[PDB]
């Protein structure tokens, strides 16, 4: 689901978890937006109103990405978090766009739904007058000799 994908993106940020931290907060938001964009691309791989909702989600993702850039500029931890929350607020708008998209996606999904150990030898099945002798070890290599060659 779209919310699950957002939760997965949030989980990835949680798994990963001043100015450097600010960039990391923006990168985490950007990575979440990238994951959302990847989810949108996967939805596209899996039109009209759905494409418009996907474009609307991308626009909200761009707003979150812009807030992610603002998070990097917000060297202060509170400033970085505040812009990250703005990206989350933009992500909430993406969820609102996803809300219509998921219903279309759900309809599309509904439409789609609608032994290694074996040895053989002909010597066992020999039609020889001396088939038992054929199976028997006749002189072959007398200490590596040519006994079989002579035969």
């Amino acid at each position: 689901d779209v919310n699950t994908f957002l939760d997965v993106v949030l989980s990835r940020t949680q798994r990963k978890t001043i100015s450097r931290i600010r960039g990391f907060y923006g990168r985490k938001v950007k990575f979440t937006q990238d994951t959302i964009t990847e989810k949108l691309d996967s939805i596209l791989q899996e039109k009209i109103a759905l494409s418009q909702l996907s474009t609307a989600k991308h626009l909200v993702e761009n707003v979150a990405r812009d807030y992610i850039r603002l998070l990097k500029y917000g060297d202060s931890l509170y400033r970085c978090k505040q812009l990250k929350r703005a990206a989350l607020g933009r992500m909430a708008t993406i969820i609102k766009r996803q809300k219509s998209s998921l219903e279309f996606l759900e309809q599309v999904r509904q439409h789609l739904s609608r032994a290694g150990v074996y040895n053989v030898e002909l010597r066992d099945k020999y039609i020889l007058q001396d088939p038992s002798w054929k199976y028997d070890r006749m002189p072959e290599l007398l200490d590596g000799k040519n006994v079989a060659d002579f035969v």
Binding site: V120, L122, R123, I127
Partner: protein
């Protein structure tokens, strides 16, 4: 008779089906042998004789019902064992064929065990004598080794589709049996390797081309 050689479909390479005694090999595909057993294997005894110590006896020995022409590399005593192991009509003698895959080289047809075009006349004569069936130099599918490239039998010596109509006829006259140009072994130039043609019934590959399997039967009137 389509018979996939386990993962592959080279039933003929593993076993040179011969109305007297099919030249099966040690380690050859049981499913291919059993399907060959169901087709003509009762009449054509599928003795799992690894010709020259190779899992491809049909490629190694020109196993015609008149006899099997083992390669020159194969020991005479081993051939004597193999000839005795196989039925007396299908004698597995060590033909002095320069090709280690003499059965691939020599079209294992019971009527005439047509030898490879690259195989020398002495090798062809040895292939003729060892298999007791005439061995004329033939290049099936543009390949000198007609035995793997042509499903050879007394009933039918079916060539691969890569062989021309004249080339199939050339392999036909060399093996003294009709040669329908059918590319056995998944459409490859290996008709005889894919299809184990015997006089009683021309076996083929289950994973091989269906048209080639029909061509092997059509050439053999089976």
């Amino acid at each position: 008779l389509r018979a996939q050689f386990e993962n592959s479909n080279e039933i003929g390479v593993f076993s040179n089906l011969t109305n007297s005694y099919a030249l099966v090999a040690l380690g050859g595909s049981e499913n291919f042998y059993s399907v060959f057993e169901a087709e003509l294997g009762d009449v054509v005894p599928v003795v799992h004789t690894t010709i020259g110590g190779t899992r491809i006896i049909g490629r190694l020995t020109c196993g015609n019902r008149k006899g099997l022409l083992v390669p020159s590399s194969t020991t005479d005593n081993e051939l004597q064992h193999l000839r005795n192991s196989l039925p007396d009509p299908v004698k597995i003698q060590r033909v002095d064929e320069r090709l280690s895959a003499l059965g691939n080289i020599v079209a294992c047809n019971d009527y005439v065990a047509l030898v490879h075009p690259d195989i020398e006349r002495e090798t062809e004569e040895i292939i003729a004598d060892v298999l007791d069936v005439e061995v004329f130099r033939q290049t099936v599918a543009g390949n000198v080794l007609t035995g793997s490239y042509c499903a050879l039998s007394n009933q039918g010596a079916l060539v691969h589709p890569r062989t021309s109509i004249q080339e199939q006829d050339e392999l036909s006259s060399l093996l003294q049996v009709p040669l329908v140009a059918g590319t056995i072994n998944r459409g490859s130039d290996v008709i005889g390797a894919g299809l184990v043609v015997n006089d009683w019934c021309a076996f083929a590959g289950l994973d091989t081309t269906a048209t080639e399997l029909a061509v092997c039967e059509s050439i053999f009137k089976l």
